[PDB]
Amino acid sequence: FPYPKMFISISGLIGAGKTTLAEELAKEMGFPVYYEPVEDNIYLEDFYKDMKTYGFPMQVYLLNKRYQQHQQIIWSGEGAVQDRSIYEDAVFARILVKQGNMSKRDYKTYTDLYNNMSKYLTHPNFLIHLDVTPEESLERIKERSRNCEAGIPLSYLQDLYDEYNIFLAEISKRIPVIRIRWANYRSAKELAMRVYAEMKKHQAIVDVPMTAP
Amino acid sequence: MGFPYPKMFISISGLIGAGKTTLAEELAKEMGFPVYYEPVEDNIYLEDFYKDMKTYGFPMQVYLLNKRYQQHQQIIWSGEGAVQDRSIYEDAVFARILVKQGNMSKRDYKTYTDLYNNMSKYLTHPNFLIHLDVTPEESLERIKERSRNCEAGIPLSYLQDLYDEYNIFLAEISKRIPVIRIRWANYRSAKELAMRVYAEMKKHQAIVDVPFDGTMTAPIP
Ligand SMILES: Nc1ncnc2c1ncn2[C@H]1C[C@H](O)[C@@H](COP(=O)(O)OP(=O)(O)O)O1
Ligand SMILES: Nc1ncnc2c1ncn2[C@H]1C[C@H](O)[C@@H](COP(=O)(O)O)O1
């Protein structure tokens, strides 16, 4: 019987290593993996020069990409590991509003659009959050050395961190969430193996006292 | 200034006569959700089905799929979460025991599962499954206490088929979504059952922290 396919998303701060974990976890499980390559984001350079002007249009542009990716996932008829979830764009939007880089009117326009869109977007069975600090994220940004990210201050990554933690407390009411500390001491392969094992552990039927197996 | 996090959908599962609608109602009351269910009288095929399972089995599955579809459109239109007293997966559990018994052909079963798969994107998929665990013997006794005329001829073997198929279904579906399996034992009412179910749901939905490389960066509210 065509039981629904397994959809797994990774979340975490900039530079956390979401993409590496997605590839390794997708290997472990036998699933196709899906990325959004940063070079394809034609707004990103301008956004970092002027967040207030380019924030809202980039959010719409990124939502279009998430919509194409779901149609691709649905068409595949298989499970999937995604290196980013649809909820993370909303995280970025809320901090931009907080910082005065997005108007409250544009934010509401954006969330109405997201709400209208969601029915045709990917909703994960399982969310894996890579737990890293803002300082670790800043260091991973510096080591990667993307020119457009060279200007990001720590305060921006702290806002993002704070918003992610609020979001996780809410989203975990709806879907299983594994939050896994990764400071890059153990390997990405060990990380994926532990994520997989923790997923299997959490997916066991809860029996409440039976007669079963 | 909030965000439309996805809505929560809970389905109750269990054998004939297990008391799923009452558990659904009390759980929805405890959670502050609407509850949705299908009165048995609205199934205009059920009486013919029990007189002749082989003739009416397949058309009833299609008919019931239409009901699950309208019920999902209603839930989506509501813009709220929902507790439902039956999941869309259970009709297929019945279809498989009908094929095993020779009451539905392999070809008709394949037609049905193709239809379900084309349908599934416009149907309700639960975030959480609550399975009421009752034995075939307990189910037969609940059927007699309720005394639906169309159910009077149901033999124990039919309920044993159903019970076995449910256990297979629970093994697969629990790979995709959280499942709580709960026995009637010692609970005096659905309200008492519901309160334990709700407590277990909150416990199972806690974030799993894995201090893989080191201590978690901060506790989460
Ligand atoms: N909705 C959004 N709003 C603003 N910036 C976004 C955004 N979505 C992504 N970005 C930015 C943040 C980063 O500069 C880049 C994301 O790359 P990444 O998070 O570092 O992946 P990885 O962890 O695998 O290294 O794009
Ligand atoms: N898909 C399918 N095929 C055959 N018979 C079905 C199906 N769905 C429900 N039923 C029958 C089973 C019971 O007689 C009644 C539900 O009663 P309750 O006590 O609420 O479970 O309806």
From TrEMBL, chain A:
SUPFAM superfamilies in the record: P-loop containing nucleoside triphosphate hydrolases
GO molecular function, one term: deoxynucleoside kinase activity
Keywords per UniProt: ATP-binding, Kinase, Nucleotide-binding, Transferase
One of the Pfam families matching this protein, by short name: dNK
A GO CC annotation given for this chain: cytoplasm
Superkingdom in the source lineage: Eukaryota
Gene3D superfamilies recorded: P-loop containing nucleotide triphosphate hydrolases
Domain (Deoxynucleoside kinase): residue spans on this chain: 8-201
InterPro entries recorded: DCK/DGK (IPR002624), Deoxyribonucleoside_kinase (IPR050566), DNK_dom (IPR031314), P-loop_NTPase (IPR027417)
Family: Belongs to the DCK/DGK family.
Protein name: Deoxynucleoside kinase
